[PDB]
Design an enzyme around this catalytic site. Structure first.
Site, mmCIF file in Angstrom:
data_model
loop_
_atom_site.group_PDB
_atom_site.id
_atom_site.type_symbol
_atom_site.label_atom_id
_atom_site.label_comp_id
_atom_site.label_asym_id
_atom_site.label_seq_id
_atom_site.Cartn_x
_atom_site.Cartn_y
_atom_site.Cartn_z
ATOM 1 N N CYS A 48 59.835 67.808 45.427
ATOM 2 C CA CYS A 48 59.336 67.059 46.590
ATOM 3 C C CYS A 48 59.764 65.592 46.517
ATOM 4 C CB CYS A 48 57.811 67.198 46.660
ATOM 5 S SG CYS A 48 56.965 66.352 48.022
ATOM 6 N N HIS A 70 62.426 66.212 49.091
ATOM 7 C CA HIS A 70 61.772 66.501 50.348
ATOM 8 C C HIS A 70 62.633 65.808 51.401
ATOM 9 C CE1 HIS A 70 58.482 67.466 53.062
ATOM 10 N NE2 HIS A 70 58.875 66.380 53.704
#
Lengths: 188, 187
Positions: A106, A126
């Site tokens: 992420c 991400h």
């Protein structure tokens, strides 16, 4: 033979799912995981407020030999805390030189940047994290749900936590173990 | 006003199955309470990660009704929910109040233990099916998520996101549900 070992660094503001899922999947694979709290032994409040209690502090866990993989969860605040941590910087620098697998997910990969690691490695993050990660063109970017370039394993987000976790398992314990741990999860 | 959810956390509960729904529902603007079945102390889940409840079941139960009560999975967790007299009373009232009950993995076997939603179309984890169907009290399904009226069930760790998003749609709607899913970067 013993067992592989994992160091999962839990910092305030970490994304609960990106940390719990990988921890679970790995312990199912037979790997001993240590959830090391960055600020100490106290409980940790994550990105959506679930409170997880560390097995030990990063200070102690750090004094426990070498880990086969160091995993950094995501989460705006958590990645930030990881990014600003000298303790994390040392562990990551060392794992790298030791040729040890590093796994971030992420926003987590932006911690490798903060600590100048894997420069030149193909990475993914991400979508909203790409900006920060690619500033200063220190890495090649990927949009693969899971990206593994040598000894740097990265992923894109909450929805990729299983593929991320399983990818880690395959790397450490092989495919058969990976496939056995996957069946029960009833994944699509 | 925000919708409200009650998550009953018990020793041996499946970590992912309790965390994913909580995280996602909170992302949906739903005020969620992680209730510790046994009290306010930390709970040791099926894979040893320790989670700190927001409060004890006893006190969560006292703070108004809930738009939905979710039952995490896990062998031991499910078995503790099943043997809980308090869990039976929480659920009975929810069913009467016409409120959503959501269980996943082995969690729906708690519903069987407490004679909840009998005759309902439900799904469980493959390995919890014989126990769930003992007595032919339910109709079995294999969808990853099954929502029969106010009874919503799922099959396991790999379906938690769909299980949680299903709860969001039921409570806040399709739009809010898609707004929540976008960032998760689900496939």
């Amino acid at each position: 033979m013993a067992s592989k070992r994992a160091l999962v660094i839990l910092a305030k503001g970490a994304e609960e799912m990106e940390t719990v899922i990988p921890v679970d999947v790995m312990r199912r694979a037979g790997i001993k995981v240590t959830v090391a709290g960055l600020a100490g032994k106290d409980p940790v409040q994550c990105s959506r407020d679930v409170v997880i209690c560390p097995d030990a502090s990063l200070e102690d866990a750090k004094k426990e030999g070498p880990y086969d993989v160091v995993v950094l969860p995501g989460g705006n605040l958590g990645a930030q805390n990881l990014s600003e941590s000298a303790a994390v910087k040392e562990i990551l620098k060392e794992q790298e030189n030791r040729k040890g697998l590093i796994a971030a997910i992420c926003a987590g990969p932006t911690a490798l940047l903060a600590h100048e690691i894997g420069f030149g490695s193909k990475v993914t993050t991400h979508p909203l994290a790409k900006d920060k990660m690619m500033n200063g063109g220190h890495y090649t970017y990927s949009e693969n749900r899971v990206e593994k370039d040598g000894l740097i394993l990265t992923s894109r987000g909450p929805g990729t936590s299983f593929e991320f976790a399983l990818a880690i398992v395959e790397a450490l314990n092989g495919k058969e173990v990976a496939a056995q741990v996957k069946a029960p999860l009833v994944l699509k």
